[PDB]
Design a protein around this ligand. Structure first.
Ligand SMILES: Cc1cc2nc3c(=O)[nH]c(=O)nc-3n(C[C@H](O)[C@H](O)[C@H](O)COP(=O)(O)O)c2cc1C
Ligand SMILES: Cc1cn(C2CC2)c(=O)c2nn(C)c(Cc3ccc(C(F)(F)F)cc3)c12
Ligand SMILES: O=c1cc(C(O)O)[nH]c(=O)[nH]1
Length: 376
């Protein structure tokens, strides 16, 4: 399934990656998608690649990670590139400016990115208005039917007691989200990763699940009209975890996820422990991309064992090829998120990655994608 539209953007891609600033590249991409002039991938997806996380049914196992469309101003176009879902955010109750620019740097040779954004977003209220507009468009557009939209949530920079910010987001945007991702792993908000302590993380998770469950109580109508999302059901609850933890921490947090019955785990966020990128020596922030590939996959194996395979995994980190996706899936992941791939490969990310994984699934001997989960 070629397309003359995907190719023209590869021409622009080589230019931008070589001269234009990363965040400027991001703004242009988002701006083009805002006006619905990005290519489409309206082909039927392989039934062998369909996946699910409990009652969440994904048409294919590739979405866009958080931090890409932080404000939900580009949902329709990005999804129509060929992705099955998108994770908007991370959002905070009040929009922030973030750290000072430049805050995004690219090492083309190593296919790596380092960023110190600091949760720059428009705020929960405005992003909610955008998401409502999208759900209205989704009702009238076939290319958006059955596509998923998750919302990554966090805290404002100054707001102490992160629980309060989360409850506000839940109570304003919860009705329109298919799943909620708790971000306690961003390295650009000081001390957020200190909240991954078993006790703290327990109260955070339990408060989110309770707040989601409480929106349903005082409702006047049926559930079909309350949940204006894809599932027509209350959003699942996922947690996004950082890879820079020791084994003791890793096992107890996994124990907390079992006790609290979390719906999923997103492995993983960016890392701060990489020191082998010469261009990023004097740069602050977390690094993403290829140099994060092998590190995150291990973490998935370490966690897929710590939770006794009872909590599904969502893979994110250094996924650039179809074989990378299968490496993540056979390690224990059910779905994959692409971020740096879109940065370095552009519009062809979804169509390319989905084809490559399809060919590899049958060669390795599988009836469908599920058969591969944790087979390693
Ligand atoms: C510029 C930039 C901004 C990001 N913003 C967020 C964010 O707001 N929330 C979040 O959970 N992750 C954020 N991330 C992390 C990505 O979502 C993803 O977990 C990570 O980059 C690994 O993806 P990759 O290896 O395929 O590039 C951001 C990453 C980058 C590079
Ligand atoms: C999507 C994306 C994001 N970001 C930062 C947040 C991390 C980058 O730095 C990027 N660099 N490229 C090259 C992209 C992707 C891209 C492709 C095509 C164009 C266009 F053809 F329109 F010119 C523009 C941009 C980036
Ligand atoms: O989770 C996150 C958040 C940010 C940010 O918005 O600053 N950046 C990342 O690399 N990861």
């Amino acid at each position: 399934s070629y397309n003359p539209e995907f190719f023209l953007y590869d021409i622009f891609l080589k230019f931008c990656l070589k001269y234009i600033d990363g965040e400027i590249c991001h703004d242009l991409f988002l701006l083009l998608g805002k006006y619905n002039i990005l290519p489409y991938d309206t082909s039927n997806d392989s039934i062998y690649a369909c996946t699910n996380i409990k009652h969440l049914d994904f048409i294919n196992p590739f979405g866009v990670a958080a931090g890409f469309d932080k404000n939900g101003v580009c949902i329709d176009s990005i999804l129509k590139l060929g992705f099955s879902f998108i994770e908007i955010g991370t959002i905070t109750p009040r929009g922030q400016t973030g750290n000072a620019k430049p805050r995004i740097f690219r090492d083309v040779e190593s296919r790596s990115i380092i960023n110190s954004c600091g949760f720059n977003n428009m705020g929960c209220d405005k992003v909610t208005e955008n998401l409502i507009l999208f759900r209205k468009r989704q009702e009238e557009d076939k290319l958006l039917s059955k596509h998923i939209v998750g919302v990554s949530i966090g805290k404002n920079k100054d707001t102490v007691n992160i629980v309060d910010d989360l409850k506000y987001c839940i109570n304003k945007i919860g009705r329109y989200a298919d799943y909620i991702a708790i971000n306690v792993s961003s390295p650009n908000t000081p001390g957020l990763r200190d909240n991954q302590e078993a006790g703290k993380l327990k109260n955070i998770i339990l408060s989110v699940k309770e707040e989601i469950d409480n929106l349903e109580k005082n409702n006047i109508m049926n559930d079909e009209f309350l949940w204006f999302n894809t599932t027509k059901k209350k959003p699942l609850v996922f947690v996004k975890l950082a890879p820079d933890l020791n084994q003791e921490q890793k096992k107890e947090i996994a124990d907390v996820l079992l006790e609290t019955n979390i719906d999923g785990m997103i492995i993983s966020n960016t890392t701060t422990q990489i020191n082998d990128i010469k261009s990023f020596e004097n740069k602050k922030g977390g690094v993403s991309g290829a140099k994060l590939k092998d590190i995150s996959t291990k973490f998935i194996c370490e966690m897929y064992n710590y939770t006794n395979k009872q909590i599904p995994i969502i893979a994110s980190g250094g996924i650039f090829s179809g074989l990378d996706a299968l490496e993540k899936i056979e390690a224990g992941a059910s779905v994959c998120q692409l971020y740096s791939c879109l940065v370095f490969n552009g519009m062809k990310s979804a169509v390319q990655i989905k084809r490559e994984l399809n060919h590899l699934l049958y060669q390795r001997g599988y009836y469908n994608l599920k058969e591969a989960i944790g087979r390693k």
